[PDB]
Structures are given as structure tokens and as C-alpha cells.
Design a protein around this ligand. Structure first.
Ligand SMILES: C=C=CCOP(=O)(O)OP(=O)(O)O
Ligand code: SF4
Length: 309
């Protein structure tokens, strides 16, 4: 069996920064460090950090007075930020810069009282945070997930309307939503293409190339990682069996019995040690040396704040 590895795969710049923020806080201040939400959506990274003294909460009401609190990479609403700010808390913000860029635009639209539409998945923490930048009652902030959502939406003033997207969507399904938004609201303003980040766009491009060669694709990533689920979905829609797995223990032998080419990739929040263990398990099941595919180069790094060096 041939093993092919997608390139790029695995950690993006926002995930490597966010995890460094928590580890550096642990190293500078000791346990416990409180973290609002999973720092990133990966069970191995979160379990790692829990065992070293990070405590992951959903609500600021779970954090004690005087504590150090870190917001996760996905961002937080103004309400959450204000709630932390009103409490005794020392706050470090691990929001990815590419989520913050979208937040600044929604805040701008809110100040102007002009309505905004976000394309994204209901209940995802990034969507809560981004919708949570809009507060002006005179405007409006609306969520759409699909063309049908667009076809049902009514707004107050379609001459003054803008749109934004979540960072970790399907490039192709988002393009379909934007085509619908422009047909329904021809004066709508947005970015040139979408707010999907370089890491999401690149990993989807890489998994497309992987699935063109592989019969079965394994995507290393947790169930609640949006971007990881998009990579599995992309390969499934190409007619390949594709599985989202957290680690090598999840691989079922039947998925690769008599398969001649298996592809492996990883979402933006999955560490490379998990992909190494997956390759080791595929080699127990008959695979050879893993062959990395040629891929688009990534060169972006985001530094931790100087306070946490
Ligand atoms: C912040 C961030 C994204 C990094 O990956 P993630 O933590 O898996 O988040 P989503 O893909 O669910 O958005
Ligand atoms: S997936 Fe993109 S927006 Fe999200 S943390 Fe990574 S680089 Fe930032």
C-alpha cells in the first residue's frame, strides 16, 4: 500500500501562536491558567494542556477572581470581553489575527449602523465571537449558512449592506453563498473573495490533490474542528471514502484492506505527532514509506505577544 501525505497539512500560524500563548502562560505564571473554550479544536492539544494545569471553561462565571484567563484562537464577543474586563481578570487574547481582521470589519459596520451578513455555521465559537462584534440596534447582523438562507433573508436597507465570512469554511460552498448574496442584494459590499484564511484555502487545495491520487483519505482532526471536517467532506464529495480521526487508534482495518493508495492529511489544529502515529499504524497495516506530495509553500508566522515571551 502506498501512503501519500497532503501538503500543506497540520498546524497553521494562528494555532501555533494560540498554543504557545497557553504554554508560555503556564511557564511564566504556573497552574492554573484558565482558557475560555478549547484553545483550538483538538482533543490531544486540549488534553495535553489540561494535564499541565490549564482549565478550559465555557463561561467567564466559571473563572475565579484574580485568575489569568486566555481567550481561545476562535475569538470572543464584545460581551465576553467586557465581562472579563469588568471582573478581576488578567487577560491574554490568543484570537488568531485573521479572525480579529473580520471582527474589525463587523465593528466598523456596527458603528455606521449599516447591516452586515455573516456566512458561517450556527453555534460555532468563531461565529458567536464575530456576530458578537455587532451591537448597533439601528443596523442589523444576520447569519446565513446556505443559498436557501439567503433566499429567505430580509433586511432593512439593502443599499447599505456588507458581508463577512467565517475563516474555516468550504471555499466552494462559500462561493455558492456569495453568488446568491450578490444575486439577491446587488449593492452588497464585501472582500474580493471571502474571509476564508490562507491555511483553510491551502489545506482544501492540498486535499483535492491528495484525493485525486488516493482511494481513501484519513484526516487527522477532532470532531468539532470545522476546518478538519471540510477536508474530509471535500474528499467524500470526490467519491473517496474519507474519515475524520483523532488518532491512530481510530483507524479500522477494513477502511484500508486491499487499498493500494491511502492519503493522510491533518486539519490546522492537529499536531504532527498524531500524523506520525497514523503513518506508523498504516505501515503496520501494509503501508510503505510515506511520500509527501509537492505543495504550496506557507511562510506566515504570528508571534506571541511580547508579554508572554
Ligand atoms: C481559531 C481557529 C482555527 C483552527 O482550527 P480549529 O481550532 O480546529 O477551529 P475551527 O476549524 O473549528 O474553526
Ligand atoms: S485556521 Fe486560519 S484563521 Fe484559524 S487560527 Fe489558523 S490561520 Fe488563523
Amino acid at each position: 500500500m502506498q501512503i501519500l501525505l497532503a501538503n500543506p497539512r497540520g498546524f497553521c500560524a494562528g494555532v501555533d501562536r494560540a498554543i504557545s500563548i497557553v504554554e508560555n502562560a503556564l511557564a511564566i505564571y504556573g497552574a492554573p491558567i484558565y482558557v475560555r473554550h478549547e484553545v483550538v479544536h483538538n482533543r490531544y492539544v486540549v488534553d495535553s494542556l489540561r494535564e499541565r494545569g490549564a482549565i478550559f471553561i465555557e463561561q467567564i462565571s466559571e473563572v475565579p477572581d484574580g485568575a489569568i484567563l486566555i481567550f481561545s484562537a476562535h475569538g470572543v464577543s464584545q460581551a465576553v470581553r467586557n465581562e472579563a474586563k469588568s471582573r478581576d481578570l488578567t487577560v491574554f487574547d490568543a484570537t488568531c489575527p485573521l479572525v480579529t481582521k473580520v471582527h474589525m470589519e463587523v465593528a466598523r459596520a456596527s458603528r455606521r449602523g449599516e447591516e452586515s451578513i455573516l456566512i458561517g455555521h450556527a453555534g460555532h465559537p468563531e461565529v458567536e465571537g464575530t456576530m458578537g462584534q455587532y451591537s448597533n440596534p439601528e443596523g442589523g447582523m444576520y447569519l446565513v449558512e446556505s443559498p436557501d438562507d439567503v433566499w429567505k433573508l430580509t433586511v432593512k436597507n439593502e443599499e447599505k449592506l456588507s458581508f463577512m465570512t467565517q475563516t474555516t469554511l468550504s471555499v466552494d460552498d462559500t462561493s455558492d453563498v456569495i453568488d446568491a448574496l450578490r444575486k439577491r442584494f446587488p449593492k452588497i459590499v464585501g472582500p474580493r473573495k471571502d474571509d476564508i484564511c490562507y491555511a483553510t484555502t491551502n489545506r482544501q487545495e492540498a486535499v483535492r490533490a491528495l484525493a485525486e491520487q488516493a482511494e481513501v483519505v484519513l484526516v487527522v482532526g477532532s470532531k468539532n474542528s470545522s476546518n478538519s471536517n471540510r477536508l474530509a467532506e471535500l474528499a467524500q464529495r470526490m467519491g473517496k471514502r474519507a474519515f475524520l480521526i483523532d488518532d491512530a487508534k481510530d483507524i479500522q482495518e477494513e477502511w484500508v484492506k486491499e487499498v493500494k493508495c491511502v492519503g493522510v492529511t491533518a486539519g490546522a489544529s492537529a499536531p504532527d505527532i498524531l500524523v506520525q502515529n497514523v503513518v506508523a499504524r498504516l505501515q503496520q497495516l501494509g503501508g510503505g514509506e510515506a511520500i509527501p506530495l509537492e505543495g504550496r509553500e506557507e511562510n506566515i508566522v504570528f508571534e506571541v505577544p511580547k508579554e508572554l515571551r
